[PDB]
């Protein structure tokens, strides 16, 4: 989502792209 | 981002000579306009949301663009469009403070036409909405700053077209 | 070996040569202009040494043709001329014993003296016919120094070998290579016609460019924009200079294709002005003609045998991007 | 300039220039006349500053002017004095700009690499700038000299 | 190639706006200063050769290395071409003073200039200094001629210097 | 504009602007105030000019707005009036410029192509512009109207 | 250009083999399609202007492209755009006749994307326009050859993308 | 091919295919089956054609196959036969295409350069292709043989 | 990334042949020159910084390039230039060891001219400096190995120009 | 374009010094070999066609390169390949006469990799052919001229690589 852009929303680096972007794989245990 | 002062000192540096009296005259001129520039920047920062709200209402709202299939339809796309208007306002304000269009050239307008044409964003409507922002901003900061914010807003429009 | 010998002797007695001439020209002596005059006298002799080592005195000729007008105000031209005679006499003295050495050194110094006296030439002012283009004035000495293209002309009553050679040059320019020499491809009727004189060389170029050979070699392989740029190279001897040129001729190639573009380029006043009806088109490069800042890289790439292998249209992209 | 350094650090966070930064620019533009005067005095006395400071540097560190150092002979010594002139000029640009940005970009980035690949003792260069700072203190009023000393201090700080 | 009038018209046309009072005010400013611009360009055109000669001598005294055998102006072949470049700058800058806009300089002089100079080996820094020397000479001449505002005459040369120079930030 | 025409021709010459050319553009900038006034009358009264010219177009050439015609419809007739507005705006640009090249750049290069695509009678477009010329001449004085007519008539001639 | 005949024979030539029976089947298929292809080419030849007119109406007109500052604005640019659309139609019909998209690749697509990005031509609008041309052409030349024209129209879209 | 010839010419003229040219390709597609049959018989009898025509070539010009000739020895004479086979294959390509275009590309361009540098006598090569033409005429019906004769004739004319 | 040995065997591999006797002769040639190549490489390794320093002094210092406004003037630009000269010398040494300029192709010259043209770096001045580096390297490693280093420096110059 | 005399004179000219004795020695060597250079050049002119014939037969002929799809298969391609070998021989003769490789760099090697990589011409096979030309030419002109012409053939080989 273009609302989540590091140029404009620099804080929201890590908010998942979601269905609008690639899948995000994270390791849990 | 070269400002007026950085540009003056850079030009003198390229020639190699220490700062000349004529260069001092130019620097004094920029220092003179510093009061209006800083005051206008403070006004724009406080009223930034209202500038964009009025411009969106004047130009973009209740048109085809904001109705199904118009590229400002989806809630995602609406938020992205208002964010872009914020971009133009913020960097125009940076340019006004600096006294130099270099920041616009370097960061804002480089590949803007190509990104918009790839995304499908109507560049004509973006130009019209930037004009609406120019008019609202001119009202808020007065004729002194509106004249300068005008030149930087029109720089954006000329490049974006 | 004689040329190096003359050079060694001239260098050995160089200080004497300069001092004798300096005494001759010591008119109104006494500072800064003195440093200039002594150094320039040395420079005259040094380029004379370089010229005798070289095959021709062209270094002296091109590098002193306009000097008199340039240095006329600060110091007397006649004073320079007399001192040049003095240096010639001393240089003649050291080599006066040997006929060959005396002849060579005398002739080259004579060129120096004559060129300094000769009136300075006017610049090769390039007046562009059209509005969009920009006029430019190369200094004449630069063009003289530049390597000289063989400017083939299809004059009447030429030698038989010359008529065949002129045809070959046209094949080389239009088709970027000598297709006749390598593949044997060519238009026999057209070659015979211009050898006979039945058609002009401008007509030969027109027919050659709209022939199926060019259509297969340089219009079929490319998008229309790149084809236009190649056509400017082959038929007009330069690359497009401005967006107005590209707009005009892209419209032409759009409305009539290769026959139309060939007609437009040969019909152009530019063709007639630089390549007459007899002349065969020749590429106009850095030294041949004054050059412009606006299409430098594109022209540099067009004037190469690797130019046909770009299929992205460089002139239009460059001119468009500039705005 | 202080203006561009404020803009750059605000652009990173994507904010309009915050009120404190705007106030900083307001003060800087108001005292610009004083800054231009300080740079005017240093510019006018540049010949004396370089000459006196060069003599002091060579006296304190004679090894550089001894044989086997970077500046041996009048040719190399003249180039060393020119480098000291360069850094005085960059300090004047820094005073006028109000920030170390002109100093950093023109002549503090890659100094180690350039001078190391020139065969020059960088600590000695730092002491040369220290000498220029002392000379500048003599030629400036106390309040002005403290401000200009900051730019000299930044040069020596990156140098050593 | 755009004058001040043509530039204002171009901006307004792209935005589809009839010329408003702000446009008329800026157009009026160009028209009011047009007489002074014409006089200044006439001064430059009249003294064009003299300005080039003085600027060249000043540049070479400032930077002797150019005239020395290493430099690019060393022999007379290059000295002639260098003087021609000085003439180019003055001619196009006078066009720019008449025009009142630096688009003439941008489109016909500055575009591709660095590429050309790097390829031919021409040094750009000395050329920037030469343009500046022309700027000072020209400003002196127009001020003597009676043009009170030399901002019109210096700004085109300044734009050429800024575009031709590197950043050196 | 006069200025650009002079500069372009001089540049092709490769000679500095001629004294005669300079005097010509001296006249142009002298008459700039009159030009701006004429442009402002047309611009400020654009609404009335377009509406009355529309009435004259749709009565002198009633077929174009009749059923089956290009302009038939509440929206099609609106776009036609917009085109008349476009050409009035170009004419004001040209009146300011003193030359017809701004008009010719933005329109009249390919109007035949564009309107032939859109299936429009270009003679009818020409008559609409002639109606604009008539309406505008009465909003200007006789001496001023002659200047305005020149820029309104180059357009019509190109329309044919 | 390679037509289907030339492509078959050149593919065999690269291997060095005489025309095989399988290659003969390929050539026979092209000869079978020949009649419908030539008929469709004549249809497009006479109705070329109408195809462009309809397509520009369906997609390009009454949008942000033709409003001031939209790139198709100005009569010069509207003329230029309809010229480019007719370029595509002519070369696509050439490709239908020949049976191979090599005409498109050689004479249209190579370098066009760079020139378009340089000039600022919106590329999404061009793709939408030529797809609109495909709809019109399918109607005029019929479905069976509309199947065929679509292959080459899609080729142009993919190249521009 | 006929199709490529028409399209190349029309593309150069920037013109949708002329109605006559469209009829020409229509006739080509109707005639295609006969062309394919002619290619089928020639390629099916390719070994016969090359073998007996090669014997005829060597018989007619034994100096060419004699010691000192280009086809001197088993290896070189075999390669000469292979060249004859190549030109039969190209003729089949030309027959299918309906125009010399394929043969005039794959061969027949710079054949003089290649062979003359190779040392071979190109008139002798022409005689070999003539022999192949005679054999093909025997293997073809009268009207069919005329067309294949045309393509063989183009080859021998290019050779000469 | 082909050395001479790898290039010889790779050509044989493409042809599908075991190593021929002529290929053995070429391999023998590389092995024969190997000792001088390795010795010169170690010499350049020891004198790497000095080679670049001498080249900069011989061709670039006290010139228009390093005086103000010359594109090597600012300290960041001087550091960048010597970094590039270090890059050239290191890859020339790799090329001498390998016997092949392919490393120069892939790792230096595949985009260098475009980057230099875009940045504004003067190609002619860099070529002068690389030529001076050739002279210095020839002296340090000896003339016999200097001819080998010379060909790879010339390769860099040809690609860069 | 520079001959050895031009290079020597220009180096002396940049330094400003009159032609030094070492420079005289370089020029004297060139002049001394002048008779050999001219003699060899006439030999090349007479025997150039057969030099190419032998070289192609030595390496390129009866090879995969002449096999179908091998990039010298077509008669066009064969004629062009022998032409290019003629070009290399002709410009090598020019380079030998001048005594400097500048002709090769200015005319032969400022587009060679672009042309050959674009066409698909196999650089390795061309290199083998040019080496073969060097051997044949050396036999015809003798050892002294075989060495001189050899360095320029090597220049072309390495540049192509
Ligand atoms: C006048 C009686 C004599 C004289 C004095 C003088 N010379 C200059 C300057 C220049 N002279 C030249 C001429 C040449 N320079 C060369 O390098 C060569 C070929 C090797 C020639 C023929 C040049 C280029 C200059 C410098 C550029 C310029 O125009 O100044 C001056 C001017 C002052 C100064 O120091 O530059 C003066 C007063 N030179 C003569 O040849 C006469 C004998
Ligand atoms: C109703 C429950 C509340 C409310 C809403 C309200 N909304 C608007 C104006 C707009 N709303 C939208 C919303 C969307 N656009 C979309 O594409 C989607 C998803 C499909 C949504 C939800 C937009 C774009 C507008 C702008 C006007 C337009 O559509 O052109 C208004 C009008 C506001 C104004 O001042 O113009 C209102 C009043 N108001 C309430 O009181 C409720 C709490
Ligand atoms: C002079 C102060 C400096 C200098 C210049 C110099 N220039 C050239 C040659 C050329 N200059 C240009 C410049 C332009 N061409 C244009 O169209 C425009 C737009 C107005 C400009 C500015 C060009 C194209 C050339 C080359 C071809 C030509 O001259 O037409 C040279 C010649 C270089 C050489 O060795 O041949 C020189 C030396 N030289 C100096 O020393 C100054 C620092
Ligand atoms: C009115 C006097 C006549 C007429 C015209 C008519 N025009 C259109 C549609 C369009 N006209 C334009 C024209 C311009 N574009 C430009 O950039 C300029 C110069 C600045 C001009 C003049 C365009 C682009 C269109 C297309 C729609 C759009 O603007 O996007 C129509 C509508 C046509 C239709 O059916 O779609 C009409 C009717 N019609 C008349 O009867 C008059 C004689
Ligand atoms: C139309 C669908 C869209 C559009 C395009 C547009 N194009 C141009 C100008 C040019 N178009 C080309 C195209 C080609 N050149 C070729 O050789 C080929 C293949 C045969 C093609 C398709 C070129 C080279 C140009 C530039 C030259 C010129 O200016 O004519 C313009 C005009 C640009 C200008 O500034 O004048 C436009 C507007 N514009 C649209 O809105 C459509 C989406
Ligand atoms: C002096 C304090 C020390 C010293 C210096 C020394 N410097 C040089 C030569 C050069 N110095 C520079 C440095 C700069 N260039 C810049 O643009 C800037 C910032 C604006 C700086 C600081 C450069 C580029 C050179 C060489 C090229 C030139 O012409 O400027 C030398 C000579 C090196 C040589 O061997 O040739 C020396 C010796 N020497 C000392 O002893 C001091 C410790
Ligand atoms: C030195 C002889 C000349 C010179 C060069 C110069 N280069 C740069 C910057 C860059 N150089 C490169 C070059 C390479 N990248 C590579 O991967 C390789 C192969 C290993 C090479 C050779 C690149 C990528 C850059 C860009 C880095 C950047 O962001 O700058 C500069 C710096 C320019 C600047 O403005 O900072 C310079 C000055 N300059 C000279 O004067 C010499 C003639
Ligand atoms: C036979 C009728 C005559 C003849 C020929 C002969 N040819 C060669 C060698 C070659 N011939 C070719 C020919 C072609 N290559 C092509 O791509 C095409 C078009 C598809 C043709 C026709 C080639 C390439 C060669 C070289 C070897 C190879 O194929 O790689 C020879 C041998 C020459 C030699 O001594 O080396 C001969 C003898 N010879 C005759 O006597 C006939 C008159
Ligand atoms: C022969 C050893 C190899 C080979 C070569 C081959 N080359 C071409 C085509 C071209 N060669 C050049 C090269 C030059 N042009 C020049 O002007 C000069 C001297 C300054 C050179 C070296 C060029 C430009 C072309 C293309 C234009 C043309 O056709 O002449 C081809 C043709 C490729 C094609 O089909 O288009 C071939 C086959 N082929 C081999 O197998 C050898 C390994």
Question: How far is it, in rounded angstroms, from Cα C210 to Cα C260?
Answer: 9
C175 C-alpha to ligand 5 centroid (Å): 28
Question: How far is it, in rounded angstroms, from Cα H97 to Cα H3?
Answer: 9
H-assigned helices in chain H: 2-12, 19-44, 46-60, 62-65, 74-97, 101-106, 111-118, 122-139, 142-159
Sort out which chain E residues have CB atoms less than 8 A from G76's CB and list them.
Answer: none
Q: The tokens 């007609």 sit on which residue?
A: C263
* DSSP annotation of C282: -
Do the Cβ atoms of B65 and B39 come closer than 8 Å? no
Measured between CB atoms, does G69 come within 8 Å of chain J?
A: no
The structure tokens listed for B89 are 């306002």
Backbone angles phi, psi at C136, to 5 degrees: -150, 145
The structure tokens listed for C152 are 């083939």
Q: The tokens 């004449």 sit on which residue?
A: C140
Q: Is C77 in the pocket of ligand 1 (CB under 6 A)?
A: no
How far, in Å, are B33, D36, G21, H6 from residue B20 at the CA level? 20, 11, 87, 72
Do the Cβ atoms of H94 and H145 come closer than 8 Å? no
CB–CB contact G115 C317 (8 Å): yes
Residue J133 in 3-state DSSP? Answer: helix
Instruction: For residue H121, list its beta bridge partners.
Output: none
Sort out which chain H residues have CB atoms less than 8 A from C260's CB and list them.
Answer: 14
The structure tokens listed for I59 are 């061709």
Q: The tokens 């002193």 sit on which residue?
A: C64
The structure tokens listed for E8 are 């204002």
H11 C-alpha to ligand 3 centroid (Å): 43
DSSP letter string, G34-64: HHHHHHHHHHHHHSHHHHHHHHIIIIISSST
Do the Cβ atoms of I100 and J161 come closer than 8 Å? yes
Question: How far is it, in rounded angstroms, from Cα B78 to Cα F58?
Answer: 41
Pocket of ligand 9 (CB under 6 A): C 177, 305; J 60, 65, 71-72, 76-77, 80-81, 84-85, 87, 107-108, 112, 115, 119, 121-122, 125-126, 129
Q: How many CB pairs under 8 A join B and I?
A: 8
Q: Do chains A and C touch (3 or more CB pairs under 8 A)?
A: no
How far away is chain A from the Cα of D12, in angstroms, using its nearest Cα? 8
Q: Which is it for the CA torsion E120, E121, E122, E124, positive or negative?
A: positive
Measured between CB atoms, does D113 come within 8 Å of chain I?
A: yes
Sort out which chain I residues have CB atoms less than 8 A from D108's CB and list them.
Answer: 75
How far away is chain E from the Cα of F118, in angstroms, using its nearest Cα? 21
Q: Which of I49, I53, I79 sits opposite D110 (nearest CB)?
A: I79
Do the Cβ atoms of B18 and D92 come closer than 8 Å? yes
Q: Is H136 in the pocket of ligand 8 (CB under 6 A)?
A: no
Question: How far is it, in rounded angstroms, from Cα J47 to Cα J56?
Answer: 14
Q: What is the CATH number of domain B1-161?
A: 1.10.490.20
Sort out which chain G residues have CB atoms less than 8 A from J69's CB and list them.
Answer: 14-16
Strands (E), chain B: none
Residue J2 in 3-state DSSP? Answer: coil
Question: Which of B145, B5, B1, B43 lies closest to D29, judged by CA?
Answer: B5
The structure tokens listed for E101 are 């806009």
Question: How far is it, in rounded angstroms, from Cα F58 to Cα F64?
Answer: 7
Question: How far is it, in rounded angstroms, from Cα C301 to Cα C217?
Answer: 19
Please enumerate, by residue number, every residue of E annotated as part of a binding site for (2R,3E)-phycocyanobilin.
72, 77-78, 82, 84
Q: At what angle do helices E48-62 and E76-99 cross, to 10 degrees?
A: 120
Residue numbers after which chain C is interrupted (C to N above 2.5 A) read 30
CB–CB contact B41 D17 (8 Å): yes
Angle (CA) H67 H69 H74, round 5°? 65
Backbone angles phi, psi at C65, to 5 degrees: -65, -45
Residue J79 in 3-state DSSP? Answer: helix
Task: Kindly report each contact of residues I132-139 with a partner whose C-beta sits within 8 Å and lies 24 or more positions away, as own/partner.
Answer: I132/I54, I132/I55, I132/I58, I132/I59, I133/I51, I133/I52, I133/I55, I133/I85, I133/I88, I133/I89, I135/I58, I136/I51, I136/I54, I136/I55, I136/I58, I137/I44, I137/I51, I137/I89, I137/I92
Question: Which of J40, J33, J37 lies closest to J140, judged by CA?
Answer: J40
Longest alpha-carbon distance in chain E = 60
Q: Is H127 in the pocket of ligand 8 (CB under 6 A)?
A: no
DSSP letter string, chain G: ---HHHHHHHHHHHHTPPPPHHHHHHHHHHHHHHHHHHHHHHHHHHSHHHHHHHHIIIIISSSTTTSTTSSS-SHHHHHHHHHHHHHHHHHHHHHHHHSSTHHIIIIIITTHHHHHHHHT--HHHHHHHHHHHHHHHHHHH-HHHHHHHHHHHHHHHHHH-
Q: The tokens 């800024």 sit on which residue?
A: E162
Do the Cβ atoms of E2 and F4 come closer than 8 Å? yes
Measured between CB atoms, does B126 come within 8 Å of chain E?
A: no
- The alpha carbon of E38 is separated from its chain's Cα centroid by a whole number of angstroms, namely 15
Angular region, C82: left φ>0, alpha ψ -120 to 50, beta rest? alpha
* DSSP annotation of J104: I
H or E segment and range at residue F121: none
The structure tokens listed for C283 are 């590429």
C46 C-alpha to ligand 1 centroid (Å): 14
Which residue has the CA at smallest separation from atom 35 of ligand 1?
Answer: C36
Q: Which of C11, C181, C309 sits opposite J115 (nearest CB)?
A: C309
The structure tokens listed for F53 are 């010219």
Instruction: For residue C125, list its beta bridge partners.
Output: C137
User: What helix, strand, coil percent values describe chain J, rounded to 5?
Assistant: 80, 0, 20
The structure tokens listed for C94 are 């050291």
CB–CB contact A8 D14 (8 Å): yes
**Contacting subunits of D (3+ beta carbon pairs below 8 A):** A, B, E, I
Do the Cβ atoms of J148 and J34 come closer than 8 Å? no
CB–CB contact C257 H12 (8 Å): yes
Question: How far is it, in rounded angstroms, from Cα C50 to Cα E113?
Answer: 33
Atom of ligand 3 nearest to the CA of C139: 29
Q: Is C296 in the pocket of ligand 1 (CB under 6 A)?
A: no
Q: Which of I69, I124, I125 sits opposite E125 (nearest CB)?
A: I69
Closest ligand to residue G61's CA: 4
Sort out which chain C residues have CB atoms less than 8 A from G1's CB and list them.
Answer: 220
Q: Are strands C136-138 and C124-126 parallel, antiparallel or unpaired?
A: antiparallel
CB–CB contact C305 J115 (8 Å): yes
How far, in Å, are D1, D42, D53, D140 from residue D148 at the CA level? 15, 10, 16, 9
The structure tokens listed for I41 are 């490489």
Question: How far is it, in rounded angstroms, from Cα F121 to Cα J130?
Answer: 70
- The alpha carbon of E13 is separated from its chain's Cα centroid by a whole number of angstroms, namely 28
Question: Which of J93, J68, J71 lies closest to J152, judged by CA?
Answer: J93
**A4 among annotated binding-site residues:** no
Q: Which is it for the CA torsion J7, J8, J11, J16, positive or negative?
A: negative
Give the experimental resolution in Å. 3.7
Rg of chain C over all Cα atoms, to the nearest angstrom: 26
Rg of chain I over all Cα atoms, to the nearest angstrom: 18
Residue C197 in 3-state DSSP? Answer: coil
Backbone angles phi, psi at E73, to 5 degrees: -100, 5
Measured between CB atoms, does B18 come within 8 Å of chain I?
A: no
Pocket of ligand 5 (CB under 6 A): C 223-225, 246-247, 250, 316; G 65, 71-72, 76-77, 80-81, 84-85, 87, 107-108, 112, 115, 119, 121-122, 125-126, 129
Question: How far is it, in rounded angstroms, from Cα C168 to Cα C152?
Answer: 10
**Contacting subunits of A (3+ beta carbon pairs below 8 A):** B, D
Measured between CB atoms, does J68 come within 8 Å of chain G?
A: yes
Question: How far is it, in rounded angstroms, from Cα F30 to Cα F33?
Answer: 7
H or E segment and range at residue B69: none
Dihedral angle computed from the Cα positions of residues E18, E20, E22 and E28, in that order, rounded to the nearest 10 degrees: 90
Question: How far is it, in rounded angstroms, from Cα G31 to Cα G39?
Answer: 14
Angle (CA) C157 C160 C166, round 5°? 85
Do the Cβ atoms of F82 and F34 come closer than 8 Å? no
Question: How far is it, in rounded angstroms, from Cα C180 to Cα C203?
Answer: 19
Do the Cβ atoms of D102 and D89 come closer than 8 Å? no
DSSP letter string, C107-150: HHHHHHHHHHHSPPPPPEEE--SSSSS--EEE-HHHHHHS----
Question: Which of F117, G57, F90, F109 lies closest to E14, judged by CA?
Answer: F90
The structure tokens listed for G142 are 């019929």
DSSP letter string, D42-95: HHHTHHHHHHHHHHHHHHH-GGGTSTTSSS-SHHHHHHHHHHHHHHHHHHHHHH
Instruction: For residue C126, list its beta bridge partners.
Output: C136
Backbone angles phi, psi at F66, to 5 degrees: -75, 165
CB–CB contact I101 J161 (8 Å): yes
Atom of ligand 3 nearest to the CA of E108: 19
How far away is chain I from the Cα of J159, in angstroms, using its nearest Cα? 6
Give me the half-sphere count of Cα atoms (radius 13 Å) on the Cβ side of residue I18. 1
Do the Cβ atoms of A5 and B84 come closer than 8 Å? no
Question: How far is it, in rounded angstroms, from Cα F65 to Cα I84?
Answer: 72
* DSSP annotation of H13: T
Nearest CA in chain E to B161: E14
Residues with Cβ within 8 Å of residue C182, at least 6 apart in sequence: H110, H113, J79, J80, J83
H or E segment and range at residue B160: helix B123-160
The structure tokens listed for G62 are 């009454």
Do the Cβ atoms of B90 and A10 come closer than 8 Å? no
> Where exactly are the structural domains of chain I?
1-161
Measured between CB atoms, does E41 come within 8 Å of chain F?
A: yes
Domains assigned to chain D: 1-160 (1.10.490.20)
Residue C220 in 3-state DSSP? Answer: coil
**Best residue in F12, F16, F43 for a mutation probing chain E (most E CBs within 10 Å):** F16
Method: cryo-EM
Q: Which is it for the CA torsion F30, F35, F37, F43, positive or negative?
A: negative
Q: How many CB pairs under 8 A join I and J?
A: 21
Burial C256-269 (b: 16+ CB within 10 A, else e): bbbbbbbebbbebe
Sort out which chain B residues have CB atoms less than 8 A from G65's CB and list them.
Answer: 124
The structure tokens listed for G60 are 């390009």
């Amino acid at each position: 989502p273009g609302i989540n852009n590091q140029v404009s929303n620099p804080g929201a680096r890590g908010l998942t792209p979601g269905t609008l972007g690639p899948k995000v794989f994270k390791l849990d245990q | 981002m070269q400002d007026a002062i950085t540009a003056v000192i850079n030009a003198s540096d390229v020639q190699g000579k220490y700062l000349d009296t004529a260069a001092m005259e130019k620097l004094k001129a920029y220092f003179a306009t510093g009061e209006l520039r800083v005051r206008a920047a403070s006004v724009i920062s406080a009223n930034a949301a209202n500038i964009v709200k009025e411009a969106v209402a004047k130009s973009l709202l209740y048109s085809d663009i904001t109705r199904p299939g118009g590229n400002m339809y989806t809630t995602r796309r609406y938020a992205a469009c208002i964010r872009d208007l914020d971009y133009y306002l913020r960097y125009a304000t940076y340019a006004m403070l600096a006294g130099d269009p270099s920041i616009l050239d370097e960061r804002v307008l480089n590949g803007l036409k190509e990104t918009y044409n790839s995304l499908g964003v109507p560049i004509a409507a973006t130009v019209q909405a930037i004009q609406a922002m120019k008019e609202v901003t001119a009202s808020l900061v007065g004729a002194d700053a509106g004249k300068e914010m005008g030149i930087y807003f029109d720089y954006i429009c000329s490049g974006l077209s | 070996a004689k040329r190096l010998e003359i050079a060694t002797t001239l260098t050995r007695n160089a200080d004497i040569i300069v001092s004798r001439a300096a005494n001759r020209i010591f008119v109104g002596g006494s500072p800064a202009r003195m440093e200039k005059s002594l150094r320039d006298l040395d420079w005259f002799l040094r380029y004379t040494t370089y010229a005798i080592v070289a095959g021709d005195p062209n270094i002296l000729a091109v590098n002193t043709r306009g000097l008199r007008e340039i240095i006329e105000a600060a110091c007397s031209s006649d004073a320079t001329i007399a001192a040049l005679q003095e240096m010639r006499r001393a240089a003649l003295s050291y080599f006066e014993k040997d006929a060959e050495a005396k002849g060579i050194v005398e002739t080259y110094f004579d060129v120096l003296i004559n060129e300094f006296i000769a009136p300075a030439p006017s610049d090769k002012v390039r007046q562009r016919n059209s509005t969009d283009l920009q006029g430019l004035q190369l200094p004449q000495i630069y063009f003289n120094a530049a390597e000289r293209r063989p400017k083939f002309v299809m004059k009447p009553g030429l030698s038989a070998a010359e008529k065949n050679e002129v045809v070959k040059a046209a094949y080389r320019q239009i088709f970027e290579r000598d297709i006749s020499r390598a593949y044997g491809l060519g238009i026999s009727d057209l070659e015979s016609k211009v050898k006979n004189g039945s058609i002009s060389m401008k007509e030969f170029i027109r027919q050659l460019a709209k022939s199926p050979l060019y259509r297969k070699n340089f219009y079929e392989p490319y998008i229309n924009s790149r084809a236009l740029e190649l056509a400017f190279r082959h038929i007009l001897g330069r690359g497009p200079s401005s967006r107005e040129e590209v707009q005009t001729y892209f419209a032409i190639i759009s409305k009539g294709g290769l026959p139309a573009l060939v007609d437009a380029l040969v019909d152009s006043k530019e063709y007639s002005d630089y390549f007459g009806e007899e002349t065969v088109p020749y590429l106009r490069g850095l030294g041949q003609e004054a050059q412009e800042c606006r299409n430098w890289g594109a022209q540099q790439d067009l004037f190469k045998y690797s130019a046909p292998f770009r299929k992205v249209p460089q002139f239009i992209t460059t001119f468009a991007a500039q705005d | 300039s202080v203006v561009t350094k404020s803009i750059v650090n605000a652009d990173a966070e994507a904010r309009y220039l915050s009120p404190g930064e705007l106030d900083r620019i307001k003060n800087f533009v108001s005292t610009g006349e004083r800054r231009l005067r300080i740079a005017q005095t240093l510019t006018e006395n540049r010949e004396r500053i370089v000459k006196q400071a060069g003599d002091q540097l060579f006296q304190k560190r004679p090894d550089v002017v001894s044989p086997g150092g970077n500046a041996y002979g009048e040719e190399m010594t003249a180039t060393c004095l020119r480098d000291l002139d360069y850094y005085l000029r960059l300090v004047t640009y820094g005073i006028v700009a109000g920030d170390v940005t002109p100093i950093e970009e023109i002549g503090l980035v890659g100094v180690r690499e350039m001078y190391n690949s020139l065969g020059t003792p960088i600590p000695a260069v730092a002491e040369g700038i220290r000498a220029m700072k002392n000379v500048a203190c003599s030629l400036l009023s106390a309040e002005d000299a403290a401000e200009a000393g900051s730019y000299f201090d930044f040069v020596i700080g990156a140098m050593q | 190639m755009r004058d001040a009038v043509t530039t204002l018209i171009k901006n307004y046309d792209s935005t589809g706006r009839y010329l408003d009072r702000d446009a008329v005010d800026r157009l009026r400013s160009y028209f009011n200063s047009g007489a002074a611009r014409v006089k200044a360009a006439a001064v430059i055109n009249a003294n064009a050769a003299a300005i080039v000669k003085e600027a060249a001598s000043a540049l070479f005294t400032e930077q002797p290395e150019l005239i020395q055998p290493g430099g690019n102006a060393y022999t007379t072949r290059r000295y002639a071409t260098c003087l021609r470049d000085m003439d180019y700058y003055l001619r196009y800058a006078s066009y720019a003073i008449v025009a009142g806009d630096v688009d003439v300089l941008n489109e016909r002089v500055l575009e591709g200039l660095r590429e050309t100079y790097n390829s031919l080996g021409v040094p750009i820094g000395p050329t920037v200094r030469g343009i500046q020397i022309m700027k000072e000479i020209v400003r002196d001449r127009v001020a003597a001629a009676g043009i009170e505002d030399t901002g019109i005459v210096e700004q085109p040369f300044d734009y050429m210097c800024r575009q031709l120079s590197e950043v050196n930030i």
